[PDB]
């Protein structure tokens, strides 16, 4: 009953980047974890688009049914004052019109810049040649100058638990 933190389940992708599940999915994973620490989260029950994937809480891996391949997952934690504590989410648009949430650490940084009335934010130190402009609400590649739309939604807060 001492410290409060935000649960963010993340999965490791081909670019060695920890990608976050949505808040809807993270609440579902936690609900399964509370019941049995050796359980298996059928992501298809909460998200029909994640129907091939299974989260094996024993080995802490994302399991593919049809192929058998695995990707490491993790139950990561962030400050309750950050964006996942409330459900603030920053997403960018690809060529096809689909919106994709930033990495959780970058997403929090964007929200920190925004609320401080920072005109823009530079992710070069973070390992991203990208520049985010809040006035135009757009992202720009520092090297290629290519731009993409930016948006911020109020989705669902990520699960919040207590550290003793
Ligand atoms: N939990 C997830 N949520 C959304 N997309 C995912 C997830 N896990 C994997 N992907 C996407 O699936 C693609 C790779 O397919 P994957 O299911 O990992 O099998 P394999 O790596 O054997 O091709 C990656 O580009 C990744 O972006």
Author numbering: 20 to 183
What does the published report state?
The WWE domain is a relatively under-researched domain found in twelve human proteins and characterized by a conserved tryptophan-tryptophan-glutamate (WWE) sequence motif.
Our efforts to obtain a DTX1 co-crystal structure with both WWE domains bound to ADP were unsuccessful despite having excess ADP in our crystallization setups. The observed differences are in the loops that interact with the phosphate groups and may reduce the surface area of the ligand-binding site in the unbound WWE1 domain of the DTX1-WWE2-ADP structure, which therefore might discourage binding in the second site. This would, however, not be the case in the DTX1-WWE1-ADP structure, as only small conformational differences are observed. Comparing our DTX1-WWE1-ADP and DTX1-WWE2-ADP co-crystal structures with the RNF146-iso-ADPr structure revealed that the residues at the corresponding distal ribose-phosphate moeities binding sites in DTX1 WWE domains may not support high affinity binding to iso-ADPr. Specifically, neither Trp30 nor Trp111 would allow for a direct hydrogen bond to the distal ribose oxygen, while residues in the loop regions (30–38 in WWE1 and 111–122 in WWE2) would not contribute to high affinity binding to the distal phosphate group. Our biophysical data, however, supports DTX1 preference for iso-ADPr over ADPr, which may indicate a mechanism where it recognizes PAR via both iso-ADPr and ADP moieties.
